[PDB]
Design a protein around this ligand. Structure first.
Ligand SMILES: [Cl-]
Ligand SMILES: [Cl-]
Ligand SMILES: [Cl-]
Ligand code: NA
Ligand code: NA
Ligand code: NA
Ligand code: NA
Ligand code: NA
Length: 314
């Protein structure tokens, strides 16, 4: 789609080089038009942010030239049977703190990147299990999402098409283990099961589903550790989120399409609409705030953060 703002040429050339992009002549043209449309969308949003019209900023990242089909590959197809897990019982007399950050306590591995594969359910599951294994042993070991992708078909998952964290937790229970990231590295595609129990570094005894309430989620995060959740991530504002508390008016509490990990919660030093969930994504460190997003908290289950929350028991 020819016609380009050539004042973006230097940024476009740099962006292509930073993201290993090289196009023939026809593809160069329309990819550049998609990227420029997004650049201008981001720049306008941020201008509006500087005028106090949004709670968060946006930034160009690795999604800048993608088409709809490519976005869908980074979105979870999810097949929602009744949930089955044990029900989380709120500890009434535990006093949850005003702020939690499990990263700072050693529960959380570095940010990963699911690539062009609908495997966020697997990253969410490994993140929750990484946290529970650490709480149990004091050993932080990155776990194999590829193991889950290749092997948990029987439990109901569909590899890069999508899956559920509870199905992943069920697989680890049935299977008696899960291999380490180091032994079973991630390939961003579905392949034959290669689980080797000699390299298993995790186990689980089941899983717990949290009631669909932000209060219950807050108490779960405070008392358990990181929690697997699913959200409505299907908006440009999230795809190119940079910093701040994310609040998207068009967000749904019911229609979820992407799994993430809640590792904490807190508040901004200004005035209470100032609370947030601390959320680890699986879109690499280039996305968001070094791979993290602050999601609006206590704003009527914004983006469904409490609608599909669970954790494994170990
Ligand atoms: Cl600190
Ligand atoms: Cl450690
Ligand atoms: Cl509920
Ligand atoms: Na601007
Ligand atoms: Na640690
Ligand atoms: Na990464
Ligand atoms: Na910013
Ligand atoms: Na900034």
């Amino acid at each position: 789609t020819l016609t380009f703002d050539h004042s973006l040429e230097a940024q476009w050339t740099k962006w292509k080089a930073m993201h290993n992009r090289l196009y023939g002549m026809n593809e160069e043209g329309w990819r550049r038009a998609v990227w420029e449309k997004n650049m201008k969308m981001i720049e306008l949003h941020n201008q509006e942010y500087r005028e106090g019209k949004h709670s968060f900023t946006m930034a160009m990242n690795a999604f800048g030239d993608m088409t709809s089909e490519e976005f869908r590959q980074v979105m979870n197809g999810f097949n929602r049977k009744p949930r089955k897990g044990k029900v989380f019982q709120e500890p009434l007399f535990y006093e949850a703190p005003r702020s939690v950050d499990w990263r700072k306590k050693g529960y959380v591995t570095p940010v990963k990147n699911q690539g062009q594969c609908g495997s966020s359910w697997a990253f969410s599951a490994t993140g929750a299990l990484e946290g529970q294994m650490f709480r149990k042993t004091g050993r932080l070991i990155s776990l194999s999402e590829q193991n889950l992708v290749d092997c948990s078909g029987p439990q109901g998952n569909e590899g890069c098409n999508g899956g559920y964290m509870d199905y992943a937790f069920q697989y680890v229970q049935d299977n008696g283990g899960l291999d380490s990231e180091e032994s079973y590295p991630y390939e961003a595609t579905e392949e034959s099961c290669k689980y080797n129990p000699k390299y298993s570094v995790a186990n689980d005894t089941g899983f717990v589903d949290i009631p669909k309430q932000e209060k219950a989620l807050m108490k779960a995060v405070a008392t358990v550790g990181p929690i697997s959740v699913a959200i409505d991530a299907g908006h440009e504002s999230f795809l190119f989120y940079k910093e701040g508390i994310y609040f998207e008016p068009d967000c749904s509490s019911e229609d979820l399409d992407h799994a993430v990990l809640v590792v904490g919660y807190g508040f901004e030093s200004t005035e209470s609409n100032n609370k947030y969930w601390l959320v680890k994504n699986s879109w690499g460190e280039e996305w968001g705030n070094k791979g993290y997003v602050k999601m609006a908290k206590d704003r009527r289950n914004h983006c469904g953060i409490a609608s599909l929350a669970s954790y494994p028991t170990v």
